[PDB]
Amino acid sequence: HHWGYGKHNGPEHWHKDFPIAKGERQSPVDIDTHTAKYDPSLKPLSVSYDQATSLRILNNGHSFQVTFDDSQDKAVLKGGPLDGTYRLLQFHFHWGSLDGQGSEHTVDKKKYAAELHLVHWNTKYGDVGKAVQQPDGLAVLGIFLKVGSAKPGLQKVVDVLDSIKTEGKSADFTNFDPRGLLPESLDYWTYPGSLTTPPLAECVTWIVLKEPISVSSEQVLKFRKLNFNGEGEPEELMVDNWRPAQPLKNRQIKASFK
Ligand SMILES: C[C@@]12CCC[C@H]1[C@@H]1CCc3cc(OS(N)(=O)=O)ccc3[C@H]1CC2
Ligand SMILES: [Zn+2]
C-alpha cells in the first residue's frame, strides 16, 4: 500500500507516512498575484542549458521523467533568488484527466492543464540525496502548460511515451534539448517550499514562471495514455498526478516583475 493519487492513498493520506506533509513550508501553493510583492532586488534567472546531456526517460508510477547527467556543471540554474549553482537532475510533469486541472501551483486559483518541473540541486552539497536534507538544497523551475497550439520542442518526448507506458519502464533518451520547453519570458514568482511528492522534504526554492507554454490537445492526450500500474496489473490511467495547493502559512511569495 504505497502512496499515490487515488482515494485511498492520495495526498490527503500522505501525512501518515510523511508527517512533514503538514509542515510550515509545503508545496504547491496558490499564487495570489495581487499579494505577491515585487522585489526589485531579485536578479534575472540564469538558465544555462547549452551543454545539457539527457540520458533516459522513465515511468516511475507517479510521473515520467527525463534524466540528465548531473556529474558536472553542464546544465545549471543560477541567479534569480539563488545563491550558488544548481545542476539539472531531471524534468517531469503533472497533469489532469481534463484540461481544467493538472497543475500543482495555481494562479489566483486558476488551474492549468499541466505543470513542468525542472529539478536542480545545489552543488555545494555534492549530491542530490544530501541536498534534499538542506533548506536550500533544491531549486525547481515550474512552467505552466495550457492547451492550444502545439509545443514543437515537446514532441520528441510525447513520441516515446508509448515505450514507457507502465511503471518501471525506461528508454534511452539522448540529445533532448530542454531549452525547447521554455516560454519567452523568465519573469517569475519565488517562495520557499517543498517536494510535492513523498518524501515532501522542505528543501526547495520554488521558481514559477509567469508565462505558460502552450501544448496541443494531441500532446496532452499522449500524457493521459500512460499508466500508474505495472504491466500485468489492472490498467489505471496516469492522470491527476498533482498535489493540491497547501497552506501558505508564514511565507511571502515574491515577484521578479512589475
Ligand atoms: C529520489 C529522492 C531521494 C534522493 C533524491 C530525491 C528526489 C529529488 C527530486 C524529487 C522531485 C520531486 O517532484 S517535485 N514535484 O517536488 O519536483 C519529488 C521527489 C523528489 C525526490 C524523491 C526521493
Ligand atoms: Zn513535480
The DSSP string of 116-175 is: EEEEEEEGGGSSHHHHTTSTTSEEEEEEEEEESS--GGGHHHHHHGGGG-STT-EEE--S
Place of cell 507516512: 17
Is residue 187 within 8 Å of residue 256, measured between CB atoms?
Answer: yes
**Separation CA 256–CA 193 (nearest Å):** 17
Among 2, 15, 62, 120, the active-site one is: 62
Query: Is 67 a pocket residue for ligand 1 (Cβ < 6 Å)?
Result: no
CA angle 7, 9, 13 (to 5 degrees): 100
Q: Determination method here?
A: X-ray
Q: How many CB atoms lie within 10 A of CB 248?
A: 17
Question: Which of 146, 118, 147 is closest to 205 using CA atoms?
Answer: 118
Q: How many CB atoms lie within 10 A of CB 41?
A: 8
CA angle 89, 225, 102 (to 5 degrees): 65
Beta-strand pair 204-209/188-193: antiparallel
CA atoms in the 13 A half-sphere facing the CB of 76:
13
Cell of 202: 522542505
Catalytic: 120? no
Sign of the torsion angle spanned by Cα atoms 178, 181, 183, 184: positive
Q: What is the resolution of this structure in A?
A: 1.5
Cell of 193: 517550499
Proximal ligand: closest to the CA of 131: 1
Query: Is 196 a pocket residue for ligand 1 (Cβ < 6 Å)?
Result: yes
Q: In sequence order, what DSSP letters do the residues of 189-226 get, joined into one string?
A: EEEEE--SSTT--S-EEEEEESSPEEE-HHHHHHHTT-
**Separation CA 206–CA 203 (nearest Å):** 10
Place of cell 492520495: 10
Residue 117 Cα to ligand 2 midpoint, Å, equals 5
- Which positions make up the binding site for Zn(2+)? 92, 94, 117
Fold entry, domain 1-258: Carbonic Anhydrase II (3.10.200)
Beta-strand pair 76-79/114-122: unpaired
Residue 141 Cα to ligand 2 midpoint, Å, equals 9
